[PDB]
Structures are given as C-alpha cells and as structure tokens.
C-alpha cells in the first residue's frame, strides 16, 4: 500500500566514492578495482574553465599532481588517462568493496538513483529521470561533480551517470561512465541551453496504472481511443508520441489491472483536456512522468 | 541548484537487516551488536491476529522456534524477550557491521529515511514525515514489517521507526525501536482509524524558504502579519498553529534569505486564500509540508 518515489539502496555505491584533488580543485571520484573515474574538469583552474584545452592541461600533469583520498587513507596514483570527458586514475590499491558492476548508457525516459556526494562523502540519495532533452532535475551544489547515478539489479550495480554541470535553468547535465555527455553539452564554464523538454508519455501511463493498483479510479472512463488519435492529442500538449513498443511494455500492468492500454490512453486524453478539477492522483495535482513501467512493477504488487 | 526530496545514504543500515522467521511468518529484523529487534507479531498465526495475547504466545515459544538469517548465514538464537511491541532475539554473533547508533523517539513533523526491506533484503529508500496524527505516508507491502526509519548525523545512525501495519486509508503505522507505537494504534489485525490530519505549518514555511533560496520569488509580497493573525488563518485551513519556538527554528533560513518569518507567513496566508493561480513552487502545484527546516538547510547552500 502506498506509492513513493524510491531510490535504490546506496550502500554498494557508497563504498566506491573517493575524493580527487588536483591543485585547488576537489571533486568526487568513483573507485572500482584499481581505477578511479572522475570528471576531467578537475584539472582546470580559474581561467581554464571558459574554454579549456584538456589535452594540453593533461600533458602538463603528472601522477603526483593527483591526490586521491578514500576516507582517511591516501591512495597512490600510478597512472592517468583521459577518456572523453572522464579522467581515469590508476591507483596502487584495488577497492576491496568493489561491487559487481556494469557501465550502461541509458535512453531518455529511463530513471536512476543519484548518490549526491561532497568531498568523497555521500550526502543523500534520490531518484531522477533522464529527460527527453538529456537533462536531469537533480539537486547539486558546488563540489558535487563526480557524483554518480545508478540502478541495481540482483546485486549488480549498473552505473549510468556522472555529474558535471548545471544549466542556467537550474537543471543538470553529465556523462555516462565512459565520459560521453548525454545531450549536446560540453564541459566548459559557459551558459548552455537545453532543447525544449517534453513529457514522457509512457511513464505517465505507468503512473496512472500505479494509481489504479493503489485504488485511485476516479479518472477512468468507458471511452477508448486509437493510438493515432491519442498521439494527435499528445502532440498538442507536448507529450512524446506513444509507440507500439511502449504499448507492449505496458502489457504487464495492463494485464494486472484489466485496463487495456488504449483505455488508459483515453483517460490520459481526458485528463489533458479537462484537468483534474481539484482532485489528485497518488497525492499529486500534476501528472507525474518520472516513473518507468519497471519502477511501477518493482514497487507495486497485487 | 535544485531541490529534491532526499533520503540519507542507507549503507550503514543495510548491513543491519536480517530475516526473522517464526513458523510460517517471515519479516525483517534489525541486527545490532548481538541482538535482533523485530515486530512481536512475528509470533502470531492466522487466528491469533484478530486479538493476540502476546505474553501467552511468547511463553509457548523457545529459542529454536526463531530462525534468523543474515544473508545466507543462519544466526543461532540464544535468548528472547519482548519489550512493548518489539521482540528482542539474542544471537550468538555480534554484527560486525554495527554502526554507531542511537534509538530516538521523534516528534510529529520530523522526517526520516525509510529502508524498505523484504525477506531481510533492502528494496529501496525514501523519505517520510511523522504526520501530526502519527501515521506516515509510506510504501509498504506484505513482508515489509520490521523495515526501519532513521536519520544519520556524522556517521551515527539514529533509529526512530520500525514498521508494523497499514491502515484502511493506505497510510502506515509503527513503533519506536523500544516497541512503543506512535499514535493510538495497536498491533492487531483490525481496521484502525487515525485522527484527522493537519498540515505541518513550520515545514511549509521551511519549503517556501527553500524555494526562495532556489530563485522562486513570485509568491512573496510586501505585506506582513502578526503571529496571532496568522494562526487564525491557519486554523481555517487545517494548518498547525505556528509557535514562537517554530519562528526561532526558522531563524537561520530567514537570515540567509533576508525575509522575516512573519513576512513569509504573509505569503503563506495569501497562498492559502488565493491558491497558486496555475503557478508552481519548486515544481509543486500543492504546498509541501514534509521538509523540516533542518532538511532545507542540509540540502540548500548559498
Ligand atoms: C561540479 O561540481 C559543478 C557542479 C555544479 C556546481 C553548482 N551545481 C552544479 O551542479 N560543475 C561546474 O561547476 C561546471 C564546471 C565546468 C568546468 C564544466 N560549471 C557549471 O556548472 O557552470 C554552470 C554555468 C556556467 C555559466 F558560465 C553560466 F553562465 C551559467 C551556468 F549555469
Ligand atoms: C507486516 O509486514 C504488515 C505490513 C502491512 C502489510 C501490507 N502493507 C503493510 O504495511 N503488517 C500487517 O500485516 C499487520 C499485522 C498485524 C498483526 C499488526 N496488519 C495490518 O496491517 O492490517 C491492516 C488492516 C487490517 C484489517 F483487518 C483491516 F480491516 C484493514 C487493514 F488495513
């Protein structure tokens, strides 16, 4: 009973967070086996940030320019390299707490847990969706770079995000763990604009199924719609098109509730056209689009 | 930048969760030093649940009736006792991962992180407030009992909640770690009603300060109010009275934003009387009351 935005338990990742210092710049790194991963802008200084030439900056560095601190213990850096926008620091000690892990590059609309960290020390955990415009709506202050996002599946941690920057609109941008930015962003100290965002339709439908599973039924109707006709209304309200692949993904939730997917689409259409009229769904006065179908199944039951 | 509902990192608690089995009943326990804490209704059966006599049920049990599983390892139960609504199981092994910890009984309006668990295995983490009617709005399924709520302060875990039951309205009730229920509830398989709930005024004000710190200023006004006059309007909208102690607690946030507390009260009064007119605050169309002043300061900065 109840439905909450829920993060994965963070213990397996907490044991991987370290502090990386280069000069007067300190941020977080991810320590897996004998490698530490961190954002390459740790090697920048005050005037570098505007438009840094990272290959030049890195060639001017040596191993002893990097300070890695794991709790109170200093780790010796014995090699360094740059891969896209991430720095990889080889250290003399393999992390004894390295979980089973993978690196994954996620698609827009997928969610993950963020372990916000400062100075190598975890601060809090929360759930984020990769927006269609490749930003996330996080909570990050100075010193948070190198915090990572992840999913957990049977004690295997899939890392999918490393934090690098904030945009002027207060949203956030970063890379996969191979250092490739999500979206068009670059790691420079400049105001960068994201594309216009859209609402993740398949997630809104998943969340309406969660509401029914939890006993919220007031928005259902007897009407039905075609997929093409639903997507015409979706365009008008800046919702992503719903594909047949999305319909199939909602299959299990549709089977558990007995509500056909295109039936739930007819409910969403009426909610988009008439509003909620002062009612709420799962406690929300706005339609929620940061729960995937997987998130709903993981948390709901019978 | 950004403001998110954020849980504490859960690693220190994950290493304390075990499975407790009595007969065909399985739930979660908390393993600290050589004691396992769990809800006493683990010793109930099908017909016991309606109105169990727990002292009778426990006198009919012996140590070997309790199965404790820590991961794959079985722990030997070498003693047992009941304290209020919690069972305490002495085991032959002290938990090597026992954090520094305290047991605390919290006041309504305070928040904590919940580590939802099933079969001794952590499932997810989320933040909850103890409501004025001593329920929490959680997400708990069959098998979740014994999941705990906690706060963390400089690597000391303060445990404040253990989960025992759901109410017919879909909210949740439980005990402190000494086994005393929050609120009037009892651990019987019966429909129990909570008192009428009210909104946590000091938390709503804290969250309005978070919005200003984050650049949301549209709800401010030039007007001001007295505390007595604010509390007359609070009663009309089912808000808790604001005390001078609450005003003092909001001191730091007021000093950082330059907005006097009674000035922010005048904003809240106008929001209560006129609504938001289709605008949002920190992404919310409803006023949020599950962030304490401490939560805001912990997460916000300059
Ligand atoms: C790394 O810790 C930090 C995270 C930021 C800091 C505040 N909240 C965050 O998420 N990342 C940065 O500070 C990056 C460093 C660059 C070298 C990549 N810069 C950044 O986020 O700048 C944002 C920015 C910059 C300019 F110039 C603007 F005009 C607006 C703006 F939002
Ligand atoms: C323990 O795991 C479980 C947690 C519940 C199960 C579903 N969601 C939860 O949070 N606790 C219980 O099942 C307790 C056991 C009692 C012996 C304390 N019962 C319970 O929650 O019942 C709720 C209930 C009971 C009756 F009879 C009703 F009519 C309504 C109702 F909500």
Curated annotation (Swiss-Prot), chains A, B:
Cell compartment(s), UniProt: Host cytoplasm; Host Golgi apparatus; Host nucleus
Job description of the protein: Cleaves the C-terminus of replicase polyprotein at 11 sites. Recognizes substrates containing the core sequence [ILMVF]-Q-|-[SGACN]. Cleaves and inactivates human TRMT1, preventing tRNA guanine(26)-dimethylation of tRNAs. May cleave human NLRP1 in lung epithelial cells, thereby activating the NLRP1 inflammasome pathway. May cleave human GSDMD, triggering alternative GSDME-mediated epithelial cell death upon activation of the NLRP1 inflammasome, which may enhance the release interleukins 1B, 6, 16 and 18. Also able to bind an ADP-ribose-1''-phosphate (ADRP).
Domain Peptidase C30 residue range list: 1-302
Protein name (record): 3C-like proteinase nsp5
Cross-link (Glycyl lysine isopeptide (Lys-Gly) (interchain with G-Cter in ubiquitin)): 5, 90
Topology Cytoplasmic: residue spans: 1-302
Superkingdom, natural source: Viruses
Residues of the full protein shown: 3264 to 3565 of 4405
Active site (UniProt): 41 (for 3cl-pro activity), 145 (for 3cl-pro activity)
Result for mutant: residue 90 to R: In strain: Beta/B.1.351
Signal peptide stretch: none
Regulation: Inhibited by pyridone-containing alpha-ketoamides compounds 13a and 13b. In turn, alpha-ketoamide 13b (tert-butyl (1-((S)-1-(((S)-4-(benzylamino)-3,4-dioxo-1-((S)-2-oxopyrrolidin-3-yl)butan-2-yl)amino)-3-cyclopropyl-1-oxopropan-2-yl)-2-oxo-1,2-dihydropyridin-3-yl)carbamate) inhibits SARS-CoV-2 replication in human lung cells. Inhibited ex vivo by michael acceptor inhibitor N3. Inhibited ex vivo by compound 11a and 11b.
Biological classification of the source: Viruses, Riboviria, Orthornavirae, Pisuviricota, Pisoniviricetes
Quaternary organization: 3CL-PRO exists as monomer and homodimer. Only the homodimer shows catalytic activity. Interacts with host FBXO22; this interaction promotes the proteasomal degradation of nsp5.
Enzymatic reactions: TSAVLQ-|-SGFRK-NH2 and SGVTFQ-|-GKFKK the two peptides corresponding to the two self-cleavage sites of the SARS 3C-like proteinase are the two most reactive peptide substrates. The enzyme exhibits a strong preference for substrates containing Gln at P1 position and Leu at P2 position
Effect of residue 205 to V: In strain: Zeta/P.2
């Amino acid at each position: 009973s109840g439905f909450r935005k829920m993060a994965f338990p963070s213990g397996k990742v907490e044991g991987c967070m370290v502090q990386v210092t280069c000069g007067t710049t300190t941020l977080n790194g991810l320590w897996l086996d004998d490698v530490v991963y961190c954002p390459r802008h740790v090697i920048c200084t005050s005037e570098d940030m505007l438009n840094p030439n990272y290959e030049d900056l890195l060639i001017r560095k040596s191993n002893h320019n990097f300070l890695v601190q794991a709790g109170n213990v200093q780790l010796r850096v014995i090699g360094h390299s740059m891969q896209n926008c991430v720095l990889k620091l080889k250290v003399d000690t393999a992390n004894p707490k390295t979980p089973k892990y993978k690196f994954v590059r996620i698609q827009p609309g997928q969610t993950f847990s963020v372990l916000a960290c400062y100075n190598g020390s975890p601060s809090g955990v929360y759930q984020c969706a990769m927006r269609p415009n490749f930003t996330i709506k996080g909570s990050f202050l100075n010193g948070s770079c190198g915090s990572v996002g992840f999913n957990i599946d049977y004690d295997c941690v899939s890392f999918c995000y490393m934090h690098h920057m904030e945009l002027p609109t207060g949203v956030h941008a970063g890379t996969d763990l191979e250092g490739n930015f999500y979206g068009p962003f670059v790691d420079r100290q400049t105001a960068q604009a994201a594309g216009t965002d859209t609402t993740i339709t398949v997630n809104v439908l998943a969340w309406l199924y969660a509401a029914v599973i939890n006993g919220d039924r007031w928005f259902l109707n007897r009407f039905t719609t075609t997929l093409n006709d639903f997507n015409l209304v979706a365009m008008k309200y800046n919702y992503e098109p719903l594909t047949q692949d999305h319909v199939d993904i909602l299959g299990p939730l549709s089977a558990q509730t007995g509500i056909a997917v295109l039936d739930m689409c007819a409910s969403l259409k009426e909610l988009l056209q008439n509003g909620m009229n002062g009612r709420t769904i799962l406690g929300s006065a706005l339609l929620e689009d940061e729960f995937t179908p997987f998130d709903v199944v993981r948390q709901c039951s019978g």
